[PDB]
Amino acid sequence: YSFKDTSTGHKNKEFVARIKSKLDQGGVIQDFINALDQLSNPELLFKDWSNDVRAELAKTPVNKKNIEKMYERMYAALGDPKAPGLGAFRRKFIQTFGKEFDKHFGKGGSKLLRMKLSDFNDITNMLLLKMNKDSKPPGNLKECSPW
């Protein structure tokens, strides 16, 4: 939702606030929505937000807000220590993309500056290849998916 502080936006967002309070007692349906989000998306997760970033990078540098909103996806997915879901191959991928991410793609998060040129598809491709090869199917006995 994206509507303003108007006399209707006030009462409508107040109605949203009361229904939002009415449901998921203890945040357990949100725990399912999270657990199956964060685990279940294979290596191919990278390919998706990467070409989304590719499309969004053709925009003017004022798109830095959307750039950050796209970085935070993968960040909450991978970079955050003890990330929600605690995936098995998720752990493997974040372990394989720690300092490697810091070197190239995020600079600790400070890559947000360089939105002028869109060549980064090269880094995307070189990552995506080597993760496609020697990739692992999610473990046939699912016990490596703790939630």
Query: Are the CB atoms for 38 and 84 separated by under 8 Å?
Result: yes
Long-range pairs for 24-27: beta carbons < 8 A, 24 or more residues apart:
none
The experimental resolution of this structure, in angstroms, equals 4.4
H helix runs in the chain, sequence order = 7-21, 28-38, 45-57, 64-74, 88-96, 99-103, 121-132
Rounded to whole angstroms, how far apart are CA atoms 147 and 39?
9
**What six digits make up the tokens of 133?**
């090869």
